[PDB]
Design a protein around this ligand. Structure first.
Ligand SMILES: Nc1ncnc2c1ncn2[C@@H]1O[C@H](COP(=O)(O)OP(=O)(O)OP(=O)(O)O)[C@@H](O)[C@H]1O
Ligand SMILES: CN1CCC[C@@H](Nc2nnc(-c3ccc(C(F)(F)F)cc3O)c3c2CCCC3)C1
Length: 818
């Protein structure tokens, strides 16, 4: 008769109309989802709200699971609620899905036992829905698991009884894992929202998820929010200008939650006829300001409220029963006031539990609890439980303590904290940083950035400049604007950093990092700067090249690996080399600095006051055409001693040019990396001439060329020369055969200066090695690796090699293949 799908869609449209879907909205007004501001979705590459489950570019495999992630306050849940409404209205996924079932993790227990009855609880008011009909058809339904990280209590991802069969009742934790791992209702779709930190215990369940990151407001969107929030444009302009003038707060308003907190504060000031003050710079300052205005007009119950929040964190409770409020002395008075001021909610949607408007407020109050004037009241215990799911990670609780524990405090809430306690905690927090900063290990504890966020909140140079002494090496990954302002602050207030690595992510090729580079240029301790493996396109390299010319720069080693630089950037690099007398080592490997780029780069290299000693030009798409300019540099540059030009097309007609100039006995070249240039035996006579005449050359790396036995013979004529000082000769797969063993054998006993001979993956022969074993015993000068790796031998040969190792300890290691 009548369909159910129409009734369910009607229910969803009627229910999902508000942003909060809760009371206490300053007079219990309706927020209206029409107020929703679109958030950008970036695939972990912009994507739409639809097409999330579609097959991708290759293999055409469908996507069952989509995972959305983002920071607290971004609006993961609002997006999920928007999807429910757009679907019910028939504009989103109107074809492929018959039902969307919204699961609110905050309301899901991991203690109780239940069947998959949430297909009933999430349905319209009718207590007996057709669960055994169309609702039971897999692939036509999508579950929305909103707030995975909000699940209260321990969550065990490794279980036996996965519990198939939706009609079977089992533990809430088992049931959630069963849906995520697709054991229950196979082929059903699933959308999960989570904080990035909580992925630690989710990655083991997802198997093959599609990851999407949720972004905050752009400048254009931030402005609209204020104008949509403040119905009077005259007041909207005032509010916008007050915030726009504060660069730090404007940046913070990136997160929807922050701009909301600020807007409410200003709205209250407007109504009361106040000056509309707003001077907050830190996260703590914003939250304190809000509560200061909210609770001052209450504060008499601050202790009880803080104890409630503290208990909720330690005993894993978000939803409070009236009995839990009464037990803290919070009843029939301030609770109503908290609802009126939109600090606390009643969850009036057919329920009688209370909650805080946001987890950051609950954690904020828990942070104050420890400092006021009952599970612990011990900071040590709190910090020891930081890296734990079971306590909610406590990221904001600790972060807020850093902000709250200060000396520059004023009236309203901030003055109700104990001084002696603040002093005791400040010492413990500093020790906490010292240990975590030193313990630079892979873990879920602070990862060299969260510590900066903590120090940022602690706006005190006396504390920050001291805490930063434990960060001699800074390795950070920056994806947003807040990351840059926080890292800039901490790096600037640091006098003991020796090296820095900046992993720029999907925000450079712009001015975004200009402020950070400016700070680095004034450091007197930074020696090594690593900017490899990120999109430092030419525009970014220009900014850096200008930065590196500062008189106080002091950077000696600069690594610019796979940055995707082109030949145009070599103009700016040349300018730096010609004036920067500090830079010693420069790595340009894997860029696209073709022959033209070298022609320009060589201008700086040949310039007076250029002190560069080690230059890497590996895999730079070079050909023999550039050998003339590189050769000129070797001839005239007395400072360049290490040159690596392998993995290029500098064939035999090219190496000959480098050799002709390197042959000159006044050339200071010590190490030459002609690794994979495609050299052939015809050029070995050029290498021979260099080895014979150039007494400075000590290391030659030829692995990857094709020399054969003829090449070895020619090299040996040079290597056996009395003036040859080569110490290390590397000969990996050079297409060698056993016919060259007589000449290699000669080197082993005739050479006086060779120390290492790394024969690698080639058909050297077992008989060849046996020859070496016998001659190596005759007072050989070889002390280092003899190679013979990546090849296989028979039993007797391997025994001989093992014997050689024991009979003549002077040889570091033989390196048998097995
Ligand atoms: N896209 C948006 N458009 C308009 N307002 C938004 C948007 N996103 C979030 N909000 C603002 O943020 C406030 C709360 O955001 P929200 O409840 O989604 O925090 P949350 O962390 O995502 O929730 P949860 O605790 O489940 O993770 C809302 O009251 C609203 O003012
Ligand atoms: C552990 N830590 C490792 C390094 C990266 C860091 N990421 C962020 N953390 N926190 C917030 C954040 C959200 C909300 C709030 C507010 F209190 F206002 F609600 C204040 C915040 O600092 C953010 C980000 C990145 C994106 C920007 C917002 C997490």
């Amino acid at each position: 008769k009548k369909d159910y799908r129409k009734k369910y869609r009607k229910y969803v449209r009627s229910r999902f109309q508000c942003i909060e879907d809760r009371n206490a909205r300053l007079g219990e007004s309706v927020s209206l989802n029409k107020r929703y501001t679109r958030l950008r979705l970036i695939k972990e590459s912009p994507i739409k709200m639809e097409l999330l489950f579609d097959p991708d570019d290759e293999h055409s495999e469908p996507v069952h699971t989509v995972v959305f992630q983002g920071a607290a306050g971004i609006g993961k849940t609002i997006l999920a609620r928007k999807m429910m409404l757009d679907w019910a209205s028939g504009t989103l996924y109107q074809d492929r899905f018959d039902y969307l079932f919204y699961i609110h993790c905050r309301e899901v227990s991991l203690v109780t036992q239940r069947s998959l009855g949430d297909l009933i609880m999430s349905c319209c008011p009718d207590p007996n829905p057709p669960i055994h009909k169309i609702v039971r058809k897999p692939s036509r339904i999508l579950f929305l698991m909103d707030g995975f990280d909000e699940l209260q209590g321990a969550f065990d991802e490794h279980i036996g009884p996965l519990c198939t069969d939706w009609q079977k009742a089992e533990r809430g934790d088992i049931l959630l894992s069963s849906l995520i791992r697709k054991k229950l209702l196979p082929e059903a779709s699933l959308l999960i929202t989570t904080r990035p930190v909580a992925l630690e215990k989710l990655q083991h369940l997802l198997d093959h998820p599609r990851h999407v990151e949720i972004l905050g407001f752009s400048e254009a969107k931030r402005k609209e929010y204020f104008f949509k929030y403040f119905s009077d444009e005259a007041q909207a302009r005032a509010a916008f200008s007050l915030i726009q003038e504060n660069e730090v707060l404007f940046t913070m308003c990136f997160i929807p939650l922050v701009c909301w907190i600020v807007c409410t504060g200003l709205k209250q000031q407007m109504e009361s006829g106040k000056s509309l003050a707003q001077t907050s710079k830190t996260t703590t300052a914003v939250y304190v300001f809000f509560l200061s205005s909210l609770l001052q007009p209450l504060c008499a119950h601050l202790w009880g409220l803080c104890s409630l929040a503290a208990d909720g964190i330690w005993n894993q409770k978000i939803l409070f029963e009236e009995s839990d409020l009464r037990n803290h002395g919070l009843q029939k008075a301030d609770v109503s006031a908290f609802l009126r001021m939109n600090l606390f909610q009643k969850e009036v949607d057919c329920e009688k539990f209370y909650s805080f408007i946001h987890m950051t407020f609950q954690e904020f109050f828990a942070a104050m609890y420890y400092l006021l004037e009952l599970p612990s009241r011990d900071v040590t215990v709190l910090l020891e439980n930081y890296g734990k799911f079971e306590k909610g990670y406590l990221i904001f609780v600790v972060r807020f303590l850093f902000g709250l524990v200060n000396q520059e405090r004023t009236s309203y809430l901030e003055k109700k904290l104990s001084c002696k306690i603040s002093q005791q905690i400040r010492l413990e927090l500093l020790k906490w940083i010292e240990v975590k900063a030193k313990a630079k290990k892979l873990q879920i504890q602070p990862s060299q950035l969260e510590l900066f966020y903590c120090l940022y909140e602690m706006q005190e140079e006396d504390f920050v400049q001291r805490a930063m002494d434990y960060f001699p090496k800074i390795e950070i990954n920056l994806s947003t604007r807040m990351d840059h302002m926080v890292s800039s602050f901490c790096i600037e207030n640091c006098h003991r950093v020796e090296s820095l690595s900046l992993g720029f992510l999907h925000n450079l090729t712009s001015s975004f990092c200009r402020g950070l580079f400016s700070v680095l240029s004034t450091s007197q301790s930074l020696t090594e700067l690593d900017l490899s493996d990120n999109s430092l396109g030419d525009p970014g390299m220009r900014v850096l090249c200008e930065t590196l010319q500062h008189p106080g720069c002091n950077i000696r080693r600069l690594w610019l690996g796979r940055c995707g630089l082109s030949h145009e950037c070599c103009f700016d690099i040349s300018l730096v080399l010609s004036s920067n007398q500090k830079l010693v080592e420069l790595d340009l490997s894997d860029n696209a600095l073709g022959d033209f780029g070298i022609r320009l780069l060589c201008v700086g290299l040949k310039h007076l006051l250029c002190n560069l000693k080690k230059l890497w030009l590996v895999s730079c798409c070079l050909t023999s055409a550039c050998c003339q300019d590189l050769a000129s540099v070797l001839s005239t540059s007395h400072s360049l001693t290490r040159l690596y030009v392998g993995e290029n097309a500098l064939g035999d007609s090219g190496v000959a040019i480098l050799c002709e100039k390197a042959k000159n006995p006044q050339c200071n070249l010590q190490k030459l990396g002609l690794v994979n240039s495609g050299l052939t035996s015809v050029c070995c006579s050029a290498l021979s001439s260099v080895l014979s005449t150039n007494q400075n050359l000590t290391h030659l790396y030829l692995r990857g060329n094709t020399l054969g036995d003829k090449g070895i013979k020619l090299l040996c004529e040079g290597l056996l020369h009395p003036d040859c000082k080569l110490q290390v000769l590397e000969l990996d797969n050079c297409n060698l055969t056993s016919h060259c063993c007589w000449d290699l054998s000669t080197l082993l006993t005739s050479s006086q200066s060779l120390r290492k001979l790394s024969l690698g993956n080639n058909d050297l022969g077992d008989l060849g090695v046996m020859m070496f074993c016998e001659v190596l015993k005759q007072q050989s000068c070889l002390l280092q690796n003899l190679g013979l790796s990546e090849m296989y031998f028979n039993y007797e040969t391997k025994s001989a090699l093992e014997t050689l190792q024991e009979e003549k300890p002077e040889l570091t290691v033989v390196f048998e293949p097995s």
